[PDB]
Amino acid sequence: AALTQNPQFKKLQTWYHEHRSDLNLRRLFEGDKDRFNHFSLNLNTNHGRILLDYSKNLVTEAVMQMLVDLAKSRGVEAARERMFNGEKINFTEDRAVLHVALRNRSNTPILVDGKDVMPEVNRVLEKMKSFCKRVRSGEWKGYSGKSITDVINIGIGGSDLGPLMVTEALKPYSAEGPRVWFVSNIDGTHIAKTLATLNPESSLFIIASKTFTTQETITNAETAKEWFLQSAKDPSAVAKHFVALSTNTTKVKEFGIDPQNMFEFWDWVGGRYSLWSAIGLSIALHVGFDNFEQLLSGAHWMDQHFRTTPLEKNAPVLLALLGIWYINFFGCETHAMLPYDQYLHRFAAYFQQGDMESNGKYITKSGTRVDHQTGPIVWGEPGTNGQHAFYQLIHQGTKMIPCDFLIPVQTQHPIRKGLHHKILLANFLAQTEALMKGKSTEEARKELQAAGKSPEDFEKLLPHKVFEGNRPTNSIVFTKLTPFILGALIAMYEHKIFVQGVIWDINSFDQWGVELGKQLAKKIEPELDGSSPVTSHDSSTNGLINFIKQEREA
Amino acid sequence: AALTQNPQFKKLQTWYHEHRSDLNLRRLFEGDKDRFNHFSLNLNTNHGRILLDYSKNLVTEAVMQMLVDLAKSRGVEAARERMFNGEKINFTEDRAVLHVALRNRSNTPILVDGKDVMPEVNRVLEKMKSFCKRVRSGEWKGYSGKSITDVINIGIGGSDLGPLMVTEALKPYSAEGPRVWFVSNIDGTHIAKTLATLNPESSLFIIASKTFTTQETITNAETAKEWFLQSAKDPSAVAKHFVALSTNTTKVKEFGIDPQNMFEFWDWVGGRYSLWSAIGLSIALHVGFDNFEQLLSGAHWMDQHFRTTPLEKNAPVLLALLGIWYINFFGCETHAMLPYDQYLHRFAAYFQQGDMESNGKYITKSGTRVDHQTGPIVWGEPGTNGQHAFYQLIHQGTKMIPCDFLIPVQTQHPIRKGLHHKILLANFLAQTEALMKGKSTEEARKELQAAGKSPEDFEKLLPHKVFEGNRPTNSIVFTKLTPFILGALIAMYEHKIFVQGVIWDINSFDQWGVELGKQLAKKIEPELDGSSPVTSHDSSTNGLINFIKQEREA
């Protein structure tokens, strides 16, 4: 019962059940003339600014205060220190959760079982630094004596989304770098379409697997290895073409990679929190190590803000709390992330793993089942595209959907005297104004009247033209999307998800839920082999397997 | 009250409220030994097959029968005929809804205000046919006498998602075609990154805008025009480089496109239903007109199945009904679409516009507000990636999420003796088996015991290892993903969404909800111009605008 047994939690339920009607945005903006000023946060990293405007939420000062009391009372401050100090807060796996050590630029000693982890972090980083410089300069040559023109990452999940989202987002900083490719799906299409344009002489394969036993990754890695070896024919040619990002040295070695080509990381680095480690090799390689270092520093900035700022004015804490409000009180299943930035088109997708794999849990620290909601379904596409696809439902559908709107004030392509970004900004501001204010029958009526129509004509059309409004949103507006700020953005959401799991009392850092599917896939594999029918399962799985064998021959 | 006033609807509520506990999948599979056979649909298009297996749903025969009775009683059969006969079922705009005429390969006369629309459909199609043949053969030359190597589509929403999703999906059929690019966001990045690799001599721009007044599309189209004219310098060079896909001739002409270069379509072609019209020019151009014709034919096949098959065995109807069950009875906000196919990676996104823009409505045919849920939030990523990102929440989160699993039995890249697809299939089957069966405390306990652990060790770990299961899914398995089948797939979901809006009594074919945002963006635009602060809005919009002016100079 943890959450629901909490006195501040219970106090919130009663207020909510009592004031819900009092929560109208339009009216809330009449009441407080500087609502904006009281519900916004200006952070200055000294490398640009981030405005967190949370004023368009169904919230009051009283609510915010009660939300902060819940966070204190549930041990957010202390949980937080346990994380930074290297304690084993991943309680089911008995692990430390230290993505924060990866970008610990100050090199404060962080101990895990007495041992400072930092000398190992800084070491792989220098290895990274020298390897990037060699590959980028052309010093690193391939087997026929050529320079690398193409970097190909092989990994799935955390070994995939981070790299890709970041390289897609930091595109402008990549001119002096080799091209990157990301092969992730076991679907043979993924590898086949990539390989069919590459030249093995100028290609570098990165096998990013924390365990180095993930089925799809290892079989994509073998397929590539076979493709390469048809050209190279000399097995030692593999050492100039393949590198590994893992924790398991023995497995790396058994795959044939030169131990000198292994960049390692640690069990305390979670997959969906790993872009900051050796897993980001493809980012640095593409955009330069210097920019990678800057990405890590932005995250270091946000780390420091998270750890030392009081909750009432703590960006990640505020975001976590607003989410709990909509999830455990208003009942909302989802949360949209809508970056008005084309380079950020994989952002939302990145947080689907980041939020959902972390917080889609139902067991408590006590081993008790939750009797309340946990993580939302996170989704979204970049604006303004989204506007022309699914906003109709956000404005006039039957569900409440809290949304995060994000945008840089300065664009990397100020074309046509900055006309494009101007229209982009104008739509970013108006969508939230419109989700807020809506439009009553009267306003629409007055418009139809003006458009010169006549009440008998428009009588049937009018209601379809009404917007109820009162829909909540956050607006996060930062100076420019550079590696520094992008680092601060990501780390902000990381701590958001963290605060949430603490209030919920779950484990944000394991993922036991992945297991059953993998167990069952292992038994189905050999069964697919003959043309003989299967009967060892439920009638559905059998029926499918059997239609498959019949059709494969068709 | 329409839906909720329906006697069969009310009968369902009581049964539901009464038998919910009886709805356990595991047990339902013990009871009926050929549940599979009674809850599956084998369609044979004669160009491959589509298995619709709906057996892993919380449903019984009784429920299905009551669901079918609801569809009949709410006029699904008749609504359907009104659509095919050209009636004005888009009741708020007073339009006919005829995406089905676009792919009416039999050329049955379909009348709109007495006039057969088919001679106009077939005409633009032949124009399409000849233009594709000229551009593909190299006969069509650019201003410096060169062949086209690059086709660039400019449009947003429906003028964008369809083309892109289909070209991404039919990639293998595109070798003899020019490359395609899709510029959609007003964000200047989108155009700038595309243009910076193109050669204006071998580039063809397509301006796809139904109204030809969409802000972002027209401003991207001007920017491209400016880029081109810096090289060409002769305004008449525009006629060999720009084509338009619109309804508004006058607007096309006022933009400077040669009327001979205009491919038109009709007001009765909805944006999110337009890939079948002249809007698919970029598909045919890339994959050949013959394959486009095949895509249209597959949709024609499904059209015929939809119209003439009795509801109890009608694919789109069955899919619609299962969705209404989860939405209006179980309460689920969403619906995941999980194609286990890398080429289908934009599929889900395509249906976000397709489902959500159509059915995110709240006003009835009577102008009454709905007092029940409408369209779900549709989302998803292709498997197996999804597995390594958000499945943890589907298996062990606190929300029920109906999922559609899709896959071809035959892959276009049977590499390594079809090992890759084999693993892909095995995961496709096991995920649904696992969402179904789960794993009790006892099973997990027995496993931990076996892994040689000891009850005092594992006592705290055990519950995290339990899967409750009982989670519903559909499995749609088709022979191979060709243009024909892809056409049948898309048309199937189109009619799914259609059946739903009818049962809900809403309008699936307008989108009034897009308007307010556009109205408000129009006023914010000029305000962003000076360095002078704005005060004409709520404190939030003002605060944002003002932070923007301060930062843009920073």
Short mmCIF file of C-alpha atoms in Angstrom, two decimals, chain A residues 61-404:
data_model
loop_
_atom_site.label_atom_id
_atom_site.label_comp_id
_atom_site.label_asym_id
_atom_site.label_seq_id
_atom_site.Cartn_x
_atom_site.Cartn_y
_atom_site.Cartn_z
CA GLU A 61 0.24 26.64 -5.35
CA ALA A 62 -1.53 24.63 -2.78
CA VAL A 63 -1.32 21.57 -5.02
CA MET A 64 2.34 22.08 -5.78
CA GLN A 65 3.12 22.41 -2.09
CA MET A 66 1.24 19.20 -1.28
CA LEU A 67 3.06 17.49 -4.20
CA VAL A 68 6.39 18.61 -2.83
CA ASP A 69 5.44 17.34 0.64
CA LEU A 70 4.73 13.90 -0.92
CA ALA A 71 8.24 13.81 -2.49
CA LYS A 72 9.97 14.64 0.82
CA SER A 73 7.90 12.27 2.75
CA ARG A 74 8.62 9.44 0.40
CA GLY A 75 12.38 9.92 0.71
CA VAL A 76 13.26 11.50 -2.61
CA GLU A 77 16.11 13.53 -1.11
CA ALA A 78 17.79 10.52 0.48
CA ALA A 79 17.11 8.09 -2.39
CA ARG A 80 18.87 10.61 -4.44
CA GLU A 81 22.10 10.62 -2.30
CA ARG A 82 22.10 6.82 -2.28
CA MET A 83 22.25 6.96 -6.08
CA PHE A 84 25.17 9.42 -6.23
CA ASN A 85 27.09 7.68 -3.41
CA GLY A 86 27.16 4.36 -5.18
CA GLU A 87 24.72 2.42 -3.06
CA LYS A 88 22.94 -0.57 -4.41
CA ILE A 89 19.58 0.95 -5.13
CA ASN A 90 18.87 -1.60 -7.87
CA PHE A 91 17.56 -3.83 -5.19
CA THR A 92 16.42 -6.88 -7.25
CA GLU A 93 19.67 -7.24 -9.06
CA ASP A 94 21.65 -5.86 -6.13
CA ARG A 95 23.49 -3.31 -8.28
CA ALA A 96 24.62 0.26 -8.02
CA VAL A 97 22.98 2.70 -10.51
CA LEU A 98 25.70 5.00 -11.65
CA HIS A 99 25.05 6.49 -15.10
CA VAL A 100 26.00 9.68 -13.16
CA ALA A 101 29.62 8.49 -12.75
CA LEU A 102 30.00 8.27 -16.57
CA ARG A 103 29.77 12.10 -16.99
CA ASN A 104 31.26 12.93 -13.57
CA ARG A 105 33.57 15.51 -15.06
CA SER A 106 34.79 16.71 -11.63
CA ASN A 107 36.13 13.22 -10.88
CA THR A 108 34.78 13.20 -7.41
CA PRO A 109 35.49 9.68 -6.06
CA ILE A 110 32.43 7.48 -6.30
CA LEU A 111 32.92 4.20 -4.56
CA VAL A 112 31.40 0.83 -5.33
CA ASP A 113 32.40 -1.68 -2.60
CA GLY A 114 35.04 0.63 -1.38
CA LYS A 115 36.61 1.01 -4.82
CA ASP A 116 36.52 4.37 -6.64
CA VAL A 117 34.94 3.76 -10.08
CA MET A 118 36.30 6.93 -11.62
CA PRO A 119 39.75 5.73 -12.75
CA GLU A 120 38.04 3.11 -14.83
CA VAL A 121 35.57 5.64 -16.31
CA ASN A 122 38.34 8.11 -17.31
CA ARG A 123 40.43 5.25 -18.76
CA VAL A 124 37.90 3.97 -21.27
CA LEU A 125 37.19 7.59 -22.07
CA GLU A 126 40.89 8.20 -23.05
CA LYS A 127 40.86 5.02 -25.06
CA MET A 128 37.83 6.48 -26.72
CA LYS A 129 39.57 9.77 -27.24
CA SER A 130 42.57 8.26 -28.96
CA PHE A 131 40.57 5.83 -31.09
CA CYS A 132 38.29 8.62 -32.34
CA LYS A 133 41.27 10.80 -33.26
CA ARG A 134 42.91 7.87 -35.17
CA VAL A 135 39.74 6.90 -37.08
CA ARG A 136 38.74 10.52 -37.80
CA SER A 137 42.20 11.62 -39.04
CA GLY A 138 42.56 8.76 -41.45
CA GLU A 139 45.50 7.33 -39.50
CA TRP A 140 43.41 4.19 -38.72
CA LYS A 141 43.49 2.17 -41.96
CA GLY A 142 41.48 -0.76 -43.13
CA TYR A 143 42.82 -3.99 -44.47
CA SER A 144 43.49 -2.71 -48.07
CA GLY A 145 45.23 0.32 -46.55
CA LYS A 146 42.19 2.66 -46.81
CA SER A 147 40.56 5.16 -44.46
CA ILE A 148 37.15 4.53 -42.82
CA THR A 149 34.24 6.23 -44.51
CA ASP A 150 31.51 4.30 -42.77
CA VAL A 151 30.87 3.38 -39.14
CA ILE A 152 28.26 0.67 -38.53
CA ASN A 153 26.87 0.13 -34.98
CA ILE A 154 25.27 -3.26 -34.22
CA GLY A 155 23.14 -3.43 -31.10
CA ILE A 156 19.57 -3.30 -30.01
CA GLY A 157 17.64 -1.40 -27.35
CA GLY A 158 19.89 0.69 -25.22
CA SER A 159 22.84 -0.16 -27.45
CA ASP A 160 20.84 1.37 -30.26
CA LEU A 161 18.33 4.10 -29.41
CA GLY A 162 20.78 6.44 -27.60
CA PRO A 163 23.47 6.50 -30.29
CA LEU A 164 20.91 6.95 -33.05
CA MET A 165 18.84 9.63 -31.32
CA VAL A 166 21.88 11.63 -30.45
CA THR A 167 23.61 11.32 -33.82
CA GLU A 168 20.35 12.25 -35.51
CA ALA A 169 20.07 15.23 -33.18
CA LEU A 170 23.66 16.49 -33.41
CA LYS A 171 23.80 16.11 -37.22
CA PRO A 172 25.27 19.60 -37.78
CA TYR A 173 28.35 18.78 -35.67
CA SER A 174 29.20 15.79 -37.86
CA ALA A 175 30.76 17.15 -41.07
CA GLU A 176 34.25 16.05 -40.40
CA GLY A 177 33.08 12.61 -39.37
CA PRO A 178 32.47 9.29 -41.14
CA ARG A 179 28.87 8.30 -41.83
CA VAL A 180 27.02 6.30 -39.20
CA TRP A 181 24.64 3.36 -39.75
CA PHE A 182 22.60 1.64 -37.08
CA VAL A 183 21.62 -2.00 -37.58
CA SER A 184 19.36 -3.23 -34.81
CA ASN A 185 16.47 -5.46 -35.82
CA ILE A 186 17.23 -9.18 -36.21
CA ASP A 187 15.05 -8.84 -39.39
CA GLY A 188 17.59 -9.65 -42.10
CA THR A 189 16.40 -6.67 -44.09
CA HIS A 190 18.09 -4.35 -41.68
CA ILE A 191 21.58 -5.81 -42.25
CA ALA A 192 21.04 -6.62 -45.92
CA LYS A 193 19.98 -3.10 -46.88
CA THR A 194 22.91 -1.58 -45.04
CA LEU A 195 25.59 -3.96 -46.23
CA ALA A 196 24.56 -3.73 -49.86
CA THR A 197 25.98 -0.22 -50.17
CA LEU A 198 29.09 -0.60 -48.10
CA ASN A 199 32.61 -1.28 -49.11
CA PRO A 200 34.31 -3.67 -46.67
CA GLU A 201 37.60 -1.90 -47.22
CA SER A 202 36.42 1.38 -45.67
CA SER A 203 33.89 -0.01 -43.23
CA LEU A 204 34.06 -0.25 -39.45
CA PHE A 205 31.69 -2.48 -37.46
CA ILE A 206 30.95 -1.75 -33.74
CA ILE A 207 29.34 -4.65 -31.79
CA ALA A 208 27.63 -2.96 -28.82
CA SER A 209 26.32 -5.55 -26.44
CA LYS A 210 26.53 -5.22 -22.70
CA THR A 211 26.23 -8.98 -22.17
CA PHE A 212 27.59 -9.84 -25.59
CA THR A 213 24.95 -12.68 -25.72
CA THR A 214 21.89 -10.80 -27.06
CA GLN A 215 20.52 -12.99 -29.81
CA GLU A 216 19.81 -10.51 -32.51
CA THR A 217 22.98 -8.55 -31.96
CA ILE A 218 25.28 -11.48 -32.06
CA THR A 219 23.60 -12.87 -35.14
CA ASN A 220 23.77 -9.60 -36.96
CA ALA A 221 27.39 -9.38 -35.88
CA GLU A 222 28.12 -12.81 -37.39
CA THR A 223 26.36 -12.03 -40.62
CA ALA A 224 28.41 -8.87 -41.01
CA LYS A 225 31.52 -10.84 -40.12
CA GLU A 226 30.72 -13.33 -42.85
CA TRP A 227 30.13 -10.52 -45.39
CA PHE A 228 33.44 -8.93 -44.49
CA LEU A 229 35.42 -12.18 -44.59
CA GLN A 230 34.28 -12.92 -48.10
CA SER A 231 36.26 -9.93 -49.18
CA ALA A 232 39.10 -9.88 -46.66
CA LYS A 233 39.78 -13.61 -46.45
CA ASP A 234 42.31 -12.99 -43.79
CA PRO A 235 40.90 -13.49 -40.30
CA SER A 236 43.36 -11.09 -38.82
CA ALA A 237 41.82 -8.42 -41.04
CA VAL A 238 39.02 -8.55 -38.48
CA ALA A 239 41.11 -6.64 -35.96
CA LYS A 240 41.12 -3.52 -38.10
CA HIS A 241 37.40 -3.69 -38.79
CA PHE A 242 35.53 -4.77 -35.68
CA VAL A 243 35.29 -3.23 -32.21
CA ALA A 244 33.30 -4.30 -29.20
CA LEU A 245 31.44 -2.43 -26.47
CA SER A 246 30.66 -4.91 -23.70
CA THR A 247 31.09 -5.96 -20.06
CA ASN A 248 31.94 -9.55 -20.91
CA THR A 249 35.59 -9.75 -22.07
CA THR A 250 35.44 -13.52 -22.31
CA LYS A 251 32.50 -13.32 -24.69
CA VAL A 252 34.15 -10.56 -26.78
CA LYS A 253 37.23 -12.77 -27.06
CA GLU A 254 35.23 -15.87 -28.00
CA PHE A 255 33.74 -13.83 -30.90
CA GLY A 256 37.21 -13.11 -32.21
CA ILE A 257 37.63 -9.41 -31.39
CA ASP A 258 41.07 -8.22 -30.36
CA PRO A 259 40.96 -7.50 -26.58
CA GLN A 260 42.82 -4.32 -27.49
CA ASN A 261 39.67 -3.41 -29.43
CA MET A 262 37.38 -3.76 -26.50
CA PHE A 263 35.95 -0.60 -24.86
CA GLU A 264 34.33 -1.65 -21.63
CA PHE A 265 31.63 -0.46 -19.27
CA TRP A 266 30.07 -1.78 -16.02
CA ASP A 267 27.13 -3.72 -14.62
CA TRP A 268 26.12 -0.54 -12.89
CA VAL A 269 25.51 1.04 -16.28
CA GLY A 270 21.95 0.33 -17.29
CA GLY A 271 21.20 -0.31 -20.98
CA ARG A 272 18.66 2.51 -21.21
CA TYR A 273 21.18 4.82 -19.42
CA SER A 274 24.29 3.86 -21.34
CA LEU A 275 24.79 6.40 -24.09
CA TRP A 276 27.07 8.16 -21.71
CA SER A 277 29.55 5.25 -21.58
CA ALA A 278 31.57 3.40 -24.13
CA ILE A 279 28.17 2.75 -25.78
CA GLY A 280 28.40 6.30 -27.19
CA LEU A 281 31.47 5.42 -29.25
CA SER A 282 29.47 5.98 -32.42
CA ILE A 283 28.40 9.48 -31.24
CA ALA A 284 32.01 10.70 -30.66
CA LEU A 285 33.29 9.05 -33.74
CA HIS A 286 30.67 10.96 -35.83
CA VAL A 287 30.60 14.27 -34.14
CA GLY A 288 34.09 14.30 -32.60
CA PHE A 289 35.16 13.39 -29.08
CA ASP A 290 35.17 17.04 -28.02
CA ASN A 291 31.44 17.31 -28.69
CA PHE A 292 30.84 14.03 -26.85
CA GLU A 293 32.68 15.50 -23.94
CA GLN A 294 30.38 18.46 -24.08
CA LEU A 295 27.30 16.26 -24.13
CA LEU A 296 28.60 14.52 -21.01
CA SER A 297 29.21 17.92 -19.39
CA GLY A 298 25.71 19.17 -19.96
CA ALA A 299 24.47 16.07 -18.25
CA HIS A 300 26.98 16.77 -15.45
CA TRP A 301 25.44 20.24 -15.07
CA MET A 302 21.91 18.89 -14.69
CA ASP A 303 23.25 16.25 -12.33
CA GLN A 304 24.53 18.94 -10.08
CA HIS A 305 21.25 20.90 -10.26
CA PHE A 306 19.27 17.81 -9.43
CA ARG A 307 21.39 16.91 -6.39
CA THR A 308 21.71 20.32 -4.74
CA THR A 309 18.62 22.30 -5.57
CA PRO A 310 15.71 22.28 -3.15
CA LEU A 311 12.72 20.33 -4.44
CA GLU A 312 10.36 23.26 -4.83
CA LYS A 313 12.60 24.62 -7.58
CA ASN A 314 14.13 21.43 -8.97
CA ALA A 315 13.42 20.80 -12.69
CA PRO A 316 13.33 16.98 -12.70
CA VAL A 317 11.38 16.89 -9.45
CA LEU A 318 8.78 19.32 -10.77
CA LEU A 319 8.33 17.29 -13.96
CA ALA A 320 8.01 14.05 -11.97
CA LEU A 321 5.44 15.55 -9.67
CA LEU A 322 3.27 16.97 -12.44
CA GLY A 323 3.24 13.55 -14.03
CA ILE A 324 2.16 11.81 -10.82
CA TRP A 325 -0.65 14.29 -10.58
CA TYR A 326 -2.05 13.28 -13.98
CA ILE A 327 -1.33 9.62 -13.58
CA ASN A 328 -2.45 8.77 -10.01
CA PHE A 329 -5.15 11.39 -9.65
CA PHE A 330 -6.52 12.29 -13.11
CA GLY A 331 -5.99 8.80 -14.46
CA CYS A 332 -4.19 9.52 -17.72
CA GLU A 333 -2.62 6.50 -19.41
CA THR A 334 -0.14 8.45 -21.49
CA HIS A 335 2.20 11.38 -21.86
CA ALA A 336 3.21 12.89 -25.22
CA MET A 337 6.60 14.34 -25.95
CA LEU A 338 6.38 16.82 -28.79
CA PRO A 339 9.72 18.39 -29.75
CA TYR A 340 9.23 21.09 -32.40
CA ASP A 341 12.56 20.17 -33.92
CA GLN A 342 13.23 17.89 -36.89
CA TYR A 343 16.65 16.78 -35.64
CA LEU A 344 14.92 15.65 -32.49
CA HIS A 345 12.60 13.22 -34.39
CA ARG A 346 13.86 10.14 -32.47
CA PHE A 347 13.65 11.83 -29.04
CA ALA A 348 10.22 10.57 -28.05
CA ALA A 349 11.09 7.05 -29.13
CA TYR A 350 14.19 7.21 -27.02
CA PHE A 351 12.15 8.00 -23.95
CA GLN A 352 9.75 5.14 -24.63
CA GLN A 353 12.56 2.88 -23.57
CA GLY A 354 13.76 5.37 -21.03
CA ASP A 355 10.49 5.85 -19.21
CA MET A 356 8.50 2.65 -19.97
CA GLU A 357 11.22 0.07 -19.52
CA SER A 358 12.18 1.79 -16.26
CA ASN A 359 8.75 2.40 -14.79
CA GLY A 360 6.41 -0.18 -16.29
CA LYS A 361 6.60 -2.14 -13.04
CA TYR A 362 4.06 -3.44 -10.59
CA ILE A 363 6.04 -4.86 -7.66
CA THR A 364 7.11 -2.73 -4.64
CA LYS A 365 10.40 -2.70 -2.61
CA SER A 366 8.39 -4.79 -0.11
CA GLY A 367 7.48 -7.36 -2.75
CA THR A 368 3.89 -6.16 -2.56
CA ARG A 369 1.79 -5.48 -5.73
CA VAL A 370 0.96 -1.90 -6.54
CA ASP A 371 -2.66 -0.88 -6.03
CA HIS A 372 -2.23 2.29 -8.09
CA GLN A 373 -0.96 3.20 -11.62
CA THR A 374 2.75 3.39 -12.55
CA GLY A 375 4.58 4.56 -15.73
CA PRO A 376 2.62 6.09 -18.61
CA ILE A 377 2.73 5.16 -22.27
CA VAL A 378 5.04 7.69 -23.83
CA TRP A 379 4.67 8.58 -27.49
CA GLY A 380 4.95 11.43 -29.97
CA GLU A 381 6.23 12.80 -33.26
CA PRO A 382 8.00 16.13 -33.86
CA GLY A 383 5.94 19.25 -34.52
CA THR A 384 4.61 20.58 -36.71
CA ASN A 385 4.09 17.21 -38.32
CA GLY A 386 2.10 15.95 -35.31
CA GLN A 387 -0.30 18.79 -35.85
CA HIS A 388 -1.21 17.44 -39.24
CA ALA A 389 -1.58 13.92 -37.98
CA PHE A 390 -2.90 13.35 -34.43
CA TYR A 391 -3.64 16.73 -32.82
CA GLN A 392 -7.33 16.46 -33.78
CA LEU A 393 -7.62 13.89 -30.99
CA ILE A 394 -5.67 15.93 -28.44
CA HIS A 395 -7.96 18.95 -28.99
CA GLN A 396 -11.29 17.21 -29.49
CA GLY A 397 -10.88 13.53 -28.43
CA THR A 398 -12.31 11.92 -25.35
CA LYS A 399 -9.01 11.54 -23.45
CA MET A 400 -6.80 13.88 -21.43
CA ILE A 401 -3.18 13.82 -22.64
CA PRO A 402 -0.54 15.83 -20.83
CA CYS A 403 2.04 16.98 -23.35
CA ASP A 404 5.59 18.25 -23.19
#
